[PDB]
Each structure stands twice: as structure tokens, then as C-alpha cells.
């Protein structure tokens, strides 16, 4: 049975982590190689690079952390941040990414999705939809949260799905970074819209909003600061998942 | 006494992962060499991966072109291991949905079926129970279709919404697996080191 997914994301910034971390029992812990070896070695499932990087000199930032990355990590891991054009997500692919996260240039040319999936498989396109309550309806925001398209997440879902997505990152910019835990209201709207795998993400912070996630029907749950910050151990949040009743990989 | 591997690196897909999946297996081992197998010049290999990620046709295509059907088959007869891994692992069956008309090594008896579950591909950390040698545990899959074979050739199952099938398979030294051991974090090096013990020790 498959097993429901513990995913690290990874904020970069110039080839680095962002911030750093709380592990110096690594040798560099701004190192993103070496931070996605220590994930894997704990227990991720999964790893996003988030590239929130400002350089003109991204694209090949962006580039040469894939390669580094390809080199040594024994997990899957999406790249994200900034993938304006089919030319963009062809080299991060080619360099080694398993899928590339794809947002605002989704939303404004759709057919992108379409063109990743043709060359690479509907498996290498992950669609990052952030989303928010405006007048009682759920709109979808481009522009890293800030621009309100004036479209319905219930029609993005679905157009997403048709343009041959393999999977919808799924954030509330609500929750983002509060640790107050998931939209799951959001998460149970959106889930009997769509058969694409759901990755929950924003706002998780104690080892109940996983679980809460998993209930809401997420494939997946994604963190970013409460790993940062070392305040959830992956192994005891998959510990606690499992006596829940989820199946989580935990292996012995 | 050296020991030769061979990974098929034609595509379609990204073969490099496999390529570092199998050189970090093989680090605690000494005067092992990995090499990338693109043309049939070249003396057989001790153990020899057939990999790829991508369409059955394509697949085939590429090993047609280059020669190196042949090659593969020479390593069958001479009795030495040959592993096909994801889409590689499809390929040593007779044919598959995927490509109608397209034949494949027909190295091992049976076909290839698309899985029965609403939802495709087959994406994510599922199960594999072995019958022998190798590591029960998860590992990670992307795939739509799925081999049909004898049980005698079938060596690990896995289930999929509802459906059970063959995660991995065996004919004599012909191994297959379906899911990708290079992703598979610790126990798919462990799995990868067991199929070069499995080589040096007969
Ligand atoms: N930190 C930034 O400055 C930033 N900049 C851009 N982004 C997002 O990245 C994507 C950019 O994609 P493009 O439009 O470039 O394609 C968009 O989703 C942006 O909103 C950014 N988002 C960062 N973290 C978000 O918060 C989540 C983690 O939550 P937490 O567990 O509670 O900590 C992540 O999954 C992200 O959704
Ligand atoms: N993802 C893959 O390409 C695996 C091999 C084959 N195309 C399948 O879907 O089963």
C-alpha cells in the first residue's frame, strides 16, 4: 500500500540553504547537498528546492545546485521558484531533477504544463497552486501570494488536471509559515475535484497537523520551517503518524 | 578477478541516476569498475543493467539501433546477471500495451499490462515483499504499466490500489525490478549492494 508522503522543503538562496539550519553536527548546513543527504538519512520521503533567490544570476544557480544535488541525493526531489518556460524546466529535468514546480507561469500560460508533460510524462510536473478566501470563495494567487487572478480554485483544479499536471502543491497562503496548522478546510474542498495526488502545504507546526492533513485527504504533507527550525523529528512524527493508523514508510 | 559492470546508458530517460546509484553501492567494494555501455565493442560484463525511464517503444528502439540486443543476449547465454530496472525491467518481456506490435528482449515469458487503478501512474513509496535475498520495504515507483508473468518468475509483489502484481522478477541470473532502487534512500543501496553480491558469489 502507498505509503502517505513526509516531504522537506528547502528554501535556497544562491546555491545555499536559507538561514542555515540548527545541525551543526553537519559539516555545512547553508550546503543544500549535504542538507538533502541528511533528510534522506533521517527519513524524508521527499525533498523541494525552493529557489526564492533574486540574482540575475539564478538560472545558473538554479542549474548548478541541481547538478550538485543530482550527484549525491538517493530520494526524489522538485525544483521550484522562477520556471518561466518549457527551455527553463527542459534543463533543470535534464540536469537530474525528478519533477520541476511550476506556478504563476502556469497560470498565465497553461499549456506549459501541457508541454512539460509531452517531453518529460505528466510525473515531472508539479503545478504549485497558492490559494486564499476572498468574499467566501477560494481565489488563486500568483506572484509569490501577492496577485489575485480572479480565478476560482475549484476551476484551476480541474483546468490543471486537463493540461496533464501529475500533481497539485497545494498552499494556503493563509497558513504559510504561522505553524498554526494546514488548511484542511481548503484541502477537503479541492480533494473530490480532482484524482491528482495533493500536497498539503503552509502553516504545519506540531506532529497533530500531519495527521490532520492525511484525515483531509492530502497524498502528502509538506514542511519547511518546523524542519528548519528542528522542532519535529521526522522519525517520531512518523512514529506518532503510524499509531494513528496512517501508513507511513518507517522502516526499522 | 577485477569485476566489470555495464549499465546501458542509450535512455530513454535519465540513466545517471542509476549509473551514482550503483558506484555509491559499490564504494566498500575494491577493484569494481562501472562503466557506461553504449555500443556492443566491448567484452562482456559481469553484470550488466538494462535501465530507462520512458515509453516500451522507445525503449526497444534505442537498444535496436545501438546494437546492443545482441549484446544482451550474449550476456544471458554466458550466464552472467543482467538487471533490468523500471522501464529496463518491462523490456525483458515479449510485448506491452504501451507499444502494440512492438516486440520486446522476450528474455522472460509474459507481457506487459497497464495497472487497473483510476489513478496513474502508480507514483510514490509502496511496499515490495520478496520471496528471497533482497530487502522487504518501500520503495519508490513511477510507473503506468505492469508485467504479467508466471509465479515462478516472480520475485517480489507489491499492491497497488487494490491490485497485486510483480515489483520484481527472476529467471535465472535475468533480475528485474520496477521501482528505482537509485531513489530508494538507504534500503535501495542496500538492494543495489545485494545485486553485486548476488554476482560475485554465483
Ligand atoms: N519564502 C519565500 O520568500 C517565497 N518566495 C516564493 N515563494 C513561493 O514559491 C512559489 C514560486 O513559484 P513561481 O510562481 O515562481 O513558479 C510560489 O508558491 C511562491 O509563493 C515563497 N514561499 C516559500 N515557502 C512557502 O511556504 C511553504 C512552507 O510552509 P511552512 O511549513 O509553514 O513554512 C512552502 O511550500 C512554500 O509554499
Ligand atoms: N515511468 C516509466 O516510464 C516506467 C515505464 C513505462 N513507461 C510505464 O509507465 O510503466
Redesign the pocket.
Known amino acids: 500500500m502507498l505509503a502517505k508522503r513526509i516531504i522537506a522543503?528547502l528554501?535556497v538562496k544562491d546555491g545555499r540553504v536559507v538561514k542555515g539550519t540548527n545541525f551543526e553536527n553537519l559539516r555545512d548546513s547553508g550546503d543544500p547537498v549535504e542538507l538533502g543527504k541528511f533528510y534522506s538519512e533521517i527519513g524524508i520521503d521527499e525533498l523541494v528546492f525552493?529557489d526564492?533567490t533574486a540574482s540575475v544570476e539564478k538560472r545558473k544557480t538554479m542549474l548548478e545546485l541541481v547538478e550538485k544535488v543530482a550527484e549525491q541525493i538517493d530520494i526524489p526531489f522538485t525544483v521550484?521558484?522562477?520556471?518561466h518556460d518549457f527551455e527553463t524546466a527542459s534543463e533543470l529535468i535534464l540536469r537530474g531533477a525528478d519533477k520541476v514546480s511550476?506556478?504563476?507561469?502556469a497560470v498565465e500560460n497553461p499549456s506549459l504544463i501541457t508541454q512539460i508533460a509531452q517531453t518529460f510524462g505528466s510525473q515531472a510536473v508539479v503545478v504549485?497552486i497558492?490559494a486564499k478566501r476572498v468574499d467566501g470563495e477560494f481565489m488563486v494567487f500568483?506572484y509569490?501570494?501577492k496577485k489575485n487572478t480572479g480565478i476560482l480554485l475549484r476551476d484551476w483544479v480541474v483546468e490543471v488536471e486537463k493540461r496533464g499536471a501529475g500533481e497539485i502543491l497545494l498552499?494556503s497562503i493563509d497558513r504559510?509559515?504561522?505553524?498554526s496548522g494546514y488548511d484542511t478546510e481548503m484541502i477537503r474542498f479541492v480533494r473530490p475535484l480532482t484524482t491528482l495526488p495533493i500536497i498539503a502545504?503552509?502553516?504545519?507546526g506540531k506532529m497533530e497537523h500531519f495527521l490532520e492533513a492525511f484525515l483531509a485527504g492530502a497524498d502528502a504533507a509538506?514542511?519547511?520551517?518546523?524542519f528548519h527550525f528542528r522542532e519535529i523529528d521526522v522519525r517520531e512524527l512518523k512514529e506518532y503518524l503510524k499509531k494513528h493508523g496512517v501508513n507511513v514508510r518507517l522502516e526499522g | 578477478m577485477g569485476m566489470r559492470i555495464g549499465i546501458i546508458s542509450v535512455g530513454p530517460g535519465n540513466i545517471m541516476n542509476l549509473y551514482r546509484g550503483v558506484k555509491r553501492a559499490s564504494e566498500n567494494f575494491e577493484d569494481v569498475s562501472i562503466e557506461l555501455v553504449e555500443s556492443p565493442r566491448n567484452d562482456l560484463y559481469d553484470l550488466l543493467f538494462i535501465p530507462g525511464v520512458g515509453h516500451f517503444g522507445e525503449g526497444m528502439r534505442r537498444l535496436r539501433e545501438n546494437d546492443l540486443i545482441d549484446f544482451v543476449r550474449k550476456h544471458v547465454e554466458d550466464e552472467r546477471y543482467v538487471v533490468g530496472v523500471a522501464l529496463g525491467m518491462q523490456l525483458l518481456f515479449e510485448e506491452s500495451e504501451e507499444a502494440p506490435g512492438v516486440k520486446g528482449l522476450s528474455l522472460i515469458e509474459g507481457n506487459v499490462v497497464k495497472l487497473r487503478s483510476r489513478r496513474l501512474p502508480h507514483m510514490g513509496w509502496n511496499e515490495v515483499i520478496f520471496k528471497d535475498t533482497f530487502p522487504n520495504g518501500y520503495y519508490y515507483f513511477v510507473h503506468t504499466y505492469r508485467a504479467v508473468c508466471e509465479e515462478e518468475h516472480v520475485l517480489g509483489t507489491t499492491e497497488y490500489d487494490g491490485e497485486i502484481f510483480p515489483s520484481a522478477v527472476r529467471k535465472g541470473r535475468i533480475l528485474g525490478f520496477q521501482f528505482h532502487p537509485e531513489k530508494s534512500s538507504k534500503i535501495g543501496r542496500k538492494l543495489l549492494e545485494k545485486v553485486i553480491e548476488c554476482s560475485l558469489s554465483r
Open positions: 522543503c528554501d525552493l526564492i521550484g521558484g522562477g520556471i511550476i506556478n504563476t507561469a504549485a497558492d500568483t509569490s501570494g498552499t504559510d509559515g504561522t505553524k502545504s503552509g502553516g504545519a509538506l514542511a519547511a520551517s518546523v
